[PDB]
Amino acid sequence: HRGHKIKGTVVLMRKNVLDVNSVTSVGGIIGQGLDLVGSTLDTLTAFLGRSVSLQLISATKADANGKGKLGKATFLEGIITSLPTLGAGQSAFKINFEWDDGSGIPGAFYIKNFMQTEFFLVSLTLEDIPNHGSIHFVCNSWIYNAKLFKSDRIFFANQTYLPSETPAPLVKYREEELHNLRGDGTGERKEWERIYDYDVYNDLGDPDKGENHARPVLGGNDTFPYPRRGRTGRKPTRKDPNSESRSNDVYLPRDEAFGHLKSSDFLTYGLKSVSQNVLPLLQSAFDLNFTPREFDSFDEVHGLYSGGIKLPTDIISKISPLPVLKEIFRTDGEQALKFPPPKVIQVSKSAWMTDEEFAREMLAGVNPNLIRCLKDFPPRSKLDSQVYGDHTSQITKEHLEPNLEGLTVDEAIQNKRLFLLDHHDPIMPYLRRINATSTKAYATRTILFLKNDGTLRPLAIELSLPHPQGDQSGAFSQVFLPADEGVESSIWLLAKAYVVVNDSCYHQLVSHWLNTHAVVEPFIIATNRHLSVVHPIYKLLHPHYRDTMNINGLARLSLVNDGGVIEQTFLWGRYSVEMSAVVYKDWVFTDQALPADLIKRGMAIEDPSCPHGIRLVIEDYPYTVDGLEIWDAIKTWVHEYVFLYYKSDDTLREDPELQACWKELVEVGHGDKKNEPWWPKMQTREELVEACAIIIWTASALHAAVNFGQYPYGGLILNRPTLSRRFMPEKGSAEYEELRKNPQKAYLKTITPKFQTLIDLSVIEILSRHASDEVYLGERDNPNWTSDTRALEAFKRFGNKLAQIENKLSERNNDEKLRNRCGPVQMPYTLLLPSSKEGLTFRGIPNSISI
C-alpha cells in the first residue's frame, strides 16, 4: 500500500538535572522554571548528530529463526521545543523511522548512546500508520555508553503480556533480557550494570581493622538466619575469606538508584553526610570542651528547640554549607545548632511523663505493633532449659489489685482486659554481655489494664536481670508499681524508661529494619530476575520497590555496620544486627498480613458480623482501626488486578515466570526458611492475591506507620530514650538520695548521653521526612504504565477508595469519644492518612520503603 515514516518523540533527562553533585545550587522551588523545556541552553545540540541511535523491533513479523525484524538504526534528528505534557528537567527530540507494511507493528526498540555521558531515558511515543493508535514505551532508565554493553539496551511497549500471550517474534527478546538481568553470579559489580543477584550479610564488619571489628555472617546458617541482600561483587577481606571487603561505594543495579530534581530531596546523601562529616565534627566538640558533655536539667533538653546548642564557628561553618543539610539543620549564626520542636511537646511540655501517654503509645506511637492480650497468668517465656522460661514472670495476682475497677485477675483475663508488652526474651541471652559495656539494661515486662473509659493504664513493670549465679536458675526479677508522689514516682518514671529503652531498640532493629527494609529486599531481586517488565505482576509490584535497594545499601554502609550509628546509639550495641537475626527465626510471611497479626496477638477475634471480618478487643486502637481500612483497600485492588489477568488457577500454575519467581524467592531469597510449611504455594489465584497484598502492605503502610512517627514522638530523647547506662538506685544509697534531691539529673544520667542524643536526633529527623518528589500510595504511579484500560480503571477505583478513607480517618480524629487517637499530648493520629506534602509531617503513606 505505502512505505511510510513513523513519527517518534523521545523524552529524556540530562544527567546534570538529576545528579546530586551538579544539582547542589537549586533546591527550594522545583516542578518549576520554564519546565525545563530542554531546548533553551543548547547542550541539546550534542544529542543531534551521530550521537544516539534507536532501532525498532517488530512484534508481528519474524525473521528466519523466529525473532522480530529489525528496522534501520535511526539517529535523533531534531529538538522539540515544547509539548503540552513536557515536564521540568525533560528534553524532547523528534525522530522519524522508515517502516513499511510488511514489517508490521513495532513492539520493542534497541537504543545506543554514543556520547560519553549517560542520560536518563523517559519515554518513546510512536505515532503510527495502519488503523492503529499511538504506541507508548515507558522507559525510565539510565542509558550508558553503548560500548560498555555486550548487547543493546532493549525496551518494550506498553502492552502487558503473560508469558503465553507474548507475540511470537518477541518471545526470545523477552527471555534474553531476563537472562541479562540475572548475570552468572560471578564478578565485581560496576556502577553501569543492571545485574540482580543475592548474597548474605557478610558485609557489615571490617575484620582487617581488627578482631573487635568483625561481625558474624547473617544468613546461610541456622544460628543467624537472615534474608539475602543485593550481591555486590567485591573482593574478600584479607583476614577473612568469608567476609566481603569494605568500600565507600556500594553497588546496586543502576535503575534502583533514583535521582532528584531538587537538592533537598537527596536524603540518603544527607544521612551519608551525617555519619561521614557531621559525626566526626560533632565528636570533636565533646572530645575537649565547647559543649558540656551531659544534660543537667530537663530545661536544657528543651533548649535544643529554642536557642539550640552553642558550637564554635570552626565546626558550624563546616557543617552549615554542606549540600542537603541546609534543610534539616537550623542555624542561627555561629553558636547554634537548633532542632524543630517535636510534635509530642507542641501542646504540652510535660504530658509525655503521664501513665496514660506511656500506655497510649503502645497503640498509637512509633511501635504500635507489639502489644498482646494476656491469655494466661503469670506470663511465660519461650526460652529453653534455663528456668524462668519453664517458670514465669514474677508479677503476682496481689500486685495488680488497686483503684479503677475491682475485678479478680481471672475476671480481667476472661473479659479480655489484661494486656502485655513483653520485651523479656530477645535481650535476655545477651544481657550479661551487654551489661559488661557502658550500657546497663534490663529485660522488661509491662502489664496494662483496659479502663472503663476505653483508655489503657500500666499496672506493673517487671525488671529482670540474668543471673544471680549462672543461666541455670533463671531471672532475677523485681516488680515496680505506679505511684504519683514522692521518690516512689521518680522510681516509677525510671521503671518506665527501662521499658521504653527496650522498646526503642526492638522498634529500630526489628519493627523497622528487619520487618520492612531487610525482608522486602529479596522480593525486589526475585521480581527483576524472573518477571519480565511486561508481566502484569511486575507492573503491580514495581512502584512499591522505589529506592529501597538504595537506602538498604546505604544502611549497610553507614547505619547497621560495625561502629555505625545504630551500634553507637541503641541499647543492643554491637550485638544489634545479630539479635535481629535471632528474631527473624520467628518471622512468618503470612503473619505479616494485618488481620493475621492482630489475631495472633489476641487483639482481634474473627467475626463475620464486623466491618472487616474481625472484632477488636480494644476498639480505640488507632494503628489497627486505621490500618484495617488501608489493608482492605490494598487487598481489593490486588484481587481486582490479579483476576483481570488470570483466567483460572491453572493459568497461574502454567505461568513459568511467576512460578520461577516464587520458587527462587522461597528457596534462595528467604532461603534459610525454605522448608517452612506456611509458605503459600502459588497454585491458586487467592494465594497470589494474599502474597502480593502482604508485600505491598509491608512496603507502604506498615513501613509508614513504623517510620514517620520517629521524630514527632522520639525527637524528645526524654520520651523515647535509646539506651540506659545505670541500674535502678538501690533503696538507701547515694544515687537514691540524688533521686530524692535532683530526680531530673538522675533521669538524665540513666538515659542516652548528650552526644548520642545529638546523633540520634539528626538521623531520625532526616528519616521522618518526606521528600518533595515522594510518590504516595494509591493514585500515584510514575506515569502511564500500561495500555490496559481495565487496569487503569481499577487503579483509579483504588485511588478513589483511598481519598474516601483519608476523610473517614480525619473525622475519627475529631471524635471526642476516641481519646487514644490524641492523648494528653494532643497529637491526632494521622500516620495512616495516605497523602502528604513534604517535610516533617506526621502523615503520608509512600508506595515503597524510600527512606
Ligand SMILES: O=[N+]([O-])c1ccc(O)c(O)c1
Ligand atoms: O532501622 N534501620 O536500620 C534503618 C534506619 C534508617 C534507615 O534509613 C534505614 O534504611 C534503616
Ligand SMILES: [Fe+3]
Ligand atoms: Fe525506613
